[PDB]
Ligand binder design. Structure first.
Ligand SMILES: Nc1ncnc2c1ncn2[C@@H]1O[C@H](COP(=O)(O)OP(=O)(O)OP(O)(O)=S)[C@@H](O)[C@H]1O
Ligand SMILES: Nc1ncnc2c1ncn2[C@@H]1O[C@H](COP(=O)(O)OP(=O)(O)OP(O)(O)=S)[C@@H](O)[C@H]1O
Lengths: 367, 293, 74, 74, 73
């Protein structure tokens, strides 16, 4: 009864934190709820849960749950979007600075932007396509996410689904538990500040199943553009609109994507690069970044015939990770040769100097 | 005067029911968050959940969950590192003290040190290698990992992935659950004190893979050479960078590794020894060991 | 009489720890059952799983199971 | 008030069984955690787990995991 | 990991998160063919082949060990 009396005086002190605890609550959050701008039914539920966050005492384990549920409900974005682009020439110029080739993917993005800009009055349009990038490893699937998000002047967030087994990552737990967090999707919507970001769902073909179901069933709810306008998690007891989000997904093959997901997707296949494309993206992208990271810029260069040697006689692939590993090997060997005696100017690596740097060729050219 | 006299009353209430904590070490956590590393989003959410422990009373079973989350969050290192060694000759000596032959791996290490010497502050990317060592079953490619770690004056930690079948061993479980803690990577980064370890992943070609457990597709974004600076756990929900970690992995064959995971890694072949090499190894490494033991 | 007397006491207690009728539940969703369908066995089963939400704690997991059950059966 | 006095009586019973015996559990584990010859890197983990245990609830679903883990270590 | 003669100083299961020392334990494994043991596991073990008995050592076994045992029981 002593300790009851003592934290009774403590909570009476909490009535006079600053002369009152109101500014931290009934006047913290009553200001924060219409400072944001929020719909009417969620306003009803927020006000008639602050009505009993009013009455209870601080510290007891029923006020912290309601206060965290009110704090999470305040900082989710409601009706706030970035402006739309009206010049697709700027989008074309931005998409051509980050990658070379890949013409059909870029022009499909431009087709989407042209369709949405010509159509803003009939109100059946503006369902964004669920794009699936399919191809061998090493082609630019994951980098196109950030490149597209920079092109449309939107915000970007990437979610990796490579070994997700629990369904409680997509749609969360009820707030009656002793620990309670929402899903990853509404957490990502808290990360960006707007209602229309670009969300990259990476490796959707590799989700794992379990008992208590598989997360493909919960993924079908958010990724279907006829029921994602009232998406419901379990932490928030209210429906949330996820129809203005542009989703991009990546995969290596189609045979392990679930059938109710493939019926709502538009596949775009990336075929793999030819040798002229590989030496173009080695001139423009891979060799400058492998020379900057070695500290050897202005000291060593490479010709076109030498890069064609490196592509033909040292790699057998469809992507370009092996090619940049070979170019980084050349830059490392140059950095080690620099320390055992320097030169002035820059030496130029010819096609007859490649086996000094890379060793014996491991594939023989056709004649 | 009035507000710190209010602090006098709350101090009276606190020490007459004091637990030697609750004001004795919550502000020690307040000091410890601010003094160590911790980029701005991480420290904002950390101080946010720090000020919502103080009104639990321990006598709060959710006070344990929040304090263990904060003590996983503060003891994982943020921007604490070992220096690069500049004596390339001393590193060559220490690498030759442990193994005979193996010129390719030793030249790989010396070229890494040569690159780190020519960058003494230039604001460029520092990206640590990711290797896979492939060979017959007897050739030393597990002892070579800690030989490398001792020669570079770094910290070492070994993880065996030989029979691992569940994804909850790479990533963690969520903070909701009763006994949850992170995966082996964050725990290995806590055992090591720095952000530059040498982590040996002992056998990467033996992980189980089916429709009821596939950790080999969760090792993607661990070994991704472009995206593992935002590796996200399931226990910790902050992005944590693994781009400074020197990962060495070992295998006996390449056919049982999944193909999106194989091209993340630089492959170094170790072929097997001739009779002159085995005679040298037997003369100066194996026979004195057996004679001593 | 005994119905709205004891519920008058329910109201008179819930009026200050609840600011008058609370949640709009508990008296008129009782009336929403008689205005849709139903077979009388379903109606008495609905009244039985309705009257178990009366005194059970608000903020508990079992109540939400019973809440969504009687709301989806309605 | 009667069952309050009942639970307070049994809490007084469990805090001293015979003379003491209220704290034979964790003090005996504190003795046993140093009587065995553990390495120091295991002793630090064991003492941190025990210090995290001694603030909990005796009989929690989160306390029995830590106590079983300390028993397997000892 | 449990039969590695260099690295079983630090054996780590999933319940105990500590390295445990298995270097002092005398392992004896039993098999009847070597063809179904995978090659990295066979390289860690020392093989001892027990071939099968001839007729006169079968006589010695039957006189000294098997027959008094079958008589007592
Ligand atoms: N056309 C291109 N132009 C420039 N860089 C490219 C191009 N194609 C690929 N790259 C680079 O290749 C690297 C690999 O890109 P990623 O998108 O990560 O490959 P990925 O397709 O996602 O591979 P996985 O195995 O499916 S995760 C990145 O550094 C890209 O910048
Ligand atoms: N060049 C060498 N010089 C000295 N010791 C060596 C050499 N090569 C191998 N050894 C020794 O050979 C033993 C076997 O080494 P391990 O690294 O265990 O082989 P391993 O290839 O890792 O085996 P697995 O089956 O592939 S895991 C160790 O005791 C090494 O010290």
């Amino acid at each position: 009864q002593r300790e009851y009396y003592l934290r009774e005086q403590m909570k009476a002190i909490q009535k006079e934190l600053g002369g009152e605890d109101g500014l931290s609550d009934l006047e913290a959050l009553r200001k924060k709820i219409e400072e944001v701008g929020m719909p009417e039914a969620v306003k009803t539920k927020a006000l008639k849960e602050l009505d009993r966050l009013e009455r209870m005492q601080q510290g007891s384990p029923e006020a912290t749950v309601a206060r965290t549920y009110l704090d999470w409900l305040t900082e989710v974005p409601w009706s706030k979007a970035d402006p739309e682009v009206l010049d697709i020439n700027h989008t074309r110029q931005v998409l051509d600075e980050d990658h070379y080739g890949l013409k059909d993917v870029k022009e499909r993005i431009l087709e989407y932007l042209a369709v949405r800009q010509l159509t803003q009055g009939l109100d059946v349009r503006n369902k964004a396509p669920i794009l699936v990038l399919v191809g061998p490893p090493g082609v630019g699937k994951t980098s196109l996410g950030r490149s597209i998000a920079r092109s449309m002047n939107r915000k970007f967030h990437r979610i990796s689904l490579g070994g997700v087994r629990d369904e409680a990552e997509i749609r969360g737990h009820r707030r009656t538990y002793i620990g309670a967090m929402p899903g990853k999707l509404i957490h990502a919507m808290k990360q960006v500040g707007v209602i229309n970001p670009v969300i990259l769902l990476d490796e959707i073909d590799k989700m794992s199943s379990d008992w208590r179901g598989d997360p493909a069933s919960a993924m079908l709810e958010v990724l279907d553009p006829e029921q994602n306008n009232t998406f419901t998690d379990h932490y928030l007891d209210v429906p949330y609109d996820l129809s203005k989000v542009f989703f991009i997904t990546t995969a290596n093959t189609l045979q392990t994507i679930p059938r109710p997901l493939l019926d709502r997707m538009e596949v775009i296949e990336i075929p793999g690069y030819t040798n002229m494309e590989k030496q173009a993206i080695a001139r423009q992208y891979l060799w400058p970044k492998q020379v900057r990271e070695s500290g050897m810029e202005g000291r060593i260069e490479v010709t076109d015939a030498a890069i064609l040697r490196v592509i033909s006689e040292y790699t057998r692939e469809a992507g370009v990770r092996g090619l940049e590993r070979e170019l980084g090997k050349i830059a490392r060997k140059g950095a080690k040769f620099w320390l055992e005696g320097a030169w002035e100017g820059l030496r130029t690596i010819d096609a007859s100097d490649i086996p000094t740097y890379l060793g014996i060729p491991r594939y023989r050219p056709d004649k």
